[PDB]
Amino acid sequence: MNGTEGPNFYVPFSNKTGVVRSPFEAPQYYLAEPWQFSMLAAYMFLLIMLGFPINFLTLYVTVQHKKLRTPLNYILLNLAVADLFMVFGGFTTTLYTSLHGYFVFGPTGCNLEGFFATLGGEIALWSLVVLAIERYVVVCKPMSNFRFGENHAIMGVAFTWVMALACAAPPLVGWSRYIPEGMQCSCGIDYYTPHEETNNESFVIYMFVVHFIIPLIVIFFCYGQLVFTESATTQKAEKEVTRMVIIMVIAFLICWLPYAGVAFYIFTHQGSDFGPIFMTIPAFFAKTSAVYNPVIYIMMNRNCMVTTLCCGKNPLG
Numbered sequence: 140m141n142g143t144e145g146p147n148f149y150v151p152f153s154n155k156t157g158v159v160r161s162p163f164e165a166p167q168y169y170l171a172e173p174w175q176f177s178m179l180a181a182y183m184f185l186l187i188m189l190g191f192p193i194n195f196l197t198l199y200v201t202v203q204h205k206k207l208r209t210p211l212n213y214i215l216l217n218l219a220v221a222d223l224f225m226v227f228g229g230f231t232t233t234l235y236t237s238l239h240g241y242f243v244f245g246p247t248g249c250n251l252e253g254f255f256a257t258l259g260g261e262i263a264l265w266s267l268v269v270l271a272i273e274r275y276v277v278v279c280k281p282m283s284n285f286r287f288g289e290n291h292a293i294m295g296v297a298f299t300w301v302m303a304l305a306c307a308a309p310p311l312v313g314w315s316r317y318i319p320e321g322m323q324c325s326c327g328i329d330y331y332t333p334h335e336e337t338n339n340e341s342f343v344i345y346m347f348v349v350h351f352i353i354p355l356i357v358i359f360f361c362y363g364q365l366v367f368t369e370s371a372t373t374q375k376a377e378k379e380v381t382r383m384v385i386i387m388v389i390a391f392l393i394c395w396l397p398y399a400g401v402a403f404y405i406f407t408h409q410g411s412d413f414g415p416i417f418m419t420i421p422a423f424f425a426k427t428s429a430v431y432n433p434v435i436y437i438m439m440n441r442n443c444m445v446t447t448l449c450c451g452k453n454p455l456g
């Protein structure tokens with residue numbers, strides 16, 4: 140048996156070497172070397188450090204500065220919101236764990252991080268279907284009279300919640316379950332087992348198409364009709380803001396693909412001798428999601444932030 144199984148835990152190590160045990164009371168130091176965990180903490184601290192402020196500051200910049208009620212800034216005020224849940228929820232939760240080397244918060248604790256950590260990641264997918272389509276309808280605009288405003292920018296934002304909710308709830312109330320992964324410090328969806336008692340395989344189909352490949356093909360279908368793209372004074376300033384979005388389509392697919400792809404490799408190889416590092420690393424590499432969003436948002440589009448940050452502002456242009 141390449142691993143070891145229980146009622147509320149799967150772990151990739153063989154009890155052949157009579158040393159495996161639950162990750163809920165004792166530490167899992169037979170998964171890796173002690174020092175490696177310390178790094179996942181050091182890694183984790185930075186995810187809390189840089190994440191919280193840059194998200195919370197953009198939440199505080201916008202609330203005071205009422206001139207950023209733009210349909211551009213509306214979506215990037217939705218992500219800063221969803222990032223803060225992954226800091227105080229998803230990151231803190233796991234920080235604790237990495238340091239000691241075991242889920243102390245318990246089974247219910249594993250069900251808290253997952254509900255949050257999947258919520259934040261899928262909010263950055265259902266919101267990109269508004270970002271990919273907001274840009275599509277004003278470059279390939281089929282209806283001249285139409286305009287993107289606030290009844291479209293709040294009810295396009297609430298579409299992202301109401302579809303991300305339908306992604307994170309299922310494990311809590313029927314379809315599958317949240318469960319510790321790799322080094323047993325993060326907690327995501329069950330990718331490994333059948334557990335027919337709670338319908339795993341049937342949630343995964345629904346998740347791979349509807350909660351991944353549907354938003355991916357929709358962001359190839361509208362990306363594909365912007366390939367063909369006059370006095371370009373108004374164009375040229377607004378062709379680097381189109382670019383900015385692509386960098387958060389790129390950086391997304393650098394971070395979340397290693398995890399996404401390896402997750403499929405395991406779901407095909409249902410119980411091979413795949414290690415702990417193998418599944419963990421891409422998750423935590425993918426979990427920089429909440430930090431890179433507003434950095435490029437400041438390095439490409441920026442003034443308002445320094446203005447609240449200032450003390451005595453001065454006019455620059």
Ligand SMILES: *[C@@H]1O[C@H](CO)[C@@H](O[C@@H]2O[C@H](CO)[C@@H](O[C@H]3O[C@H](CO)[C@@H](O)[C@H](O)[C@@H]3O)[C@H](O)[C@H]2NC(C)=O)[C@H](O)[C@H]1NC(C)=O
Binds near residue numbers: 156161
């Ligand atoms: C494979 O690994 C174990 C041996 O490597 C094997 O033995 C049993 O492991 C459990 C671990 O929970 C022990 O249970 C003890 O756990 C704590 C001690 O802090 C107490 O709360 C419990 O009451 C209990 O004392 C068992 O003692 C141990 N059996 C032996 C060897 O005496 C498990 O069968 C395998 N591990 C898993 C998770 O399936």
Ligand SMILES: *[C@@H]1O[C@H](CO)[C@@H](O[C@@H]2O[C@H](CO)[C@@H](O)[C@H](O)[C@H]2NC(C)=O)[C@H](O)[C@H]1NC(C)=O
Binds near residue numbers: 140141408410411412
């Ligand atoms: C136990 O670990 C072994 C590693 O040697 C796994 O071996 C694979 O088993 C499949 C059969 O499903 C073979 O056809 C392959 O050649 C092996 N390699 C890989 C990477 O696929 C084996 O899967 C594990 N046993 C299980 C399923 O518990």
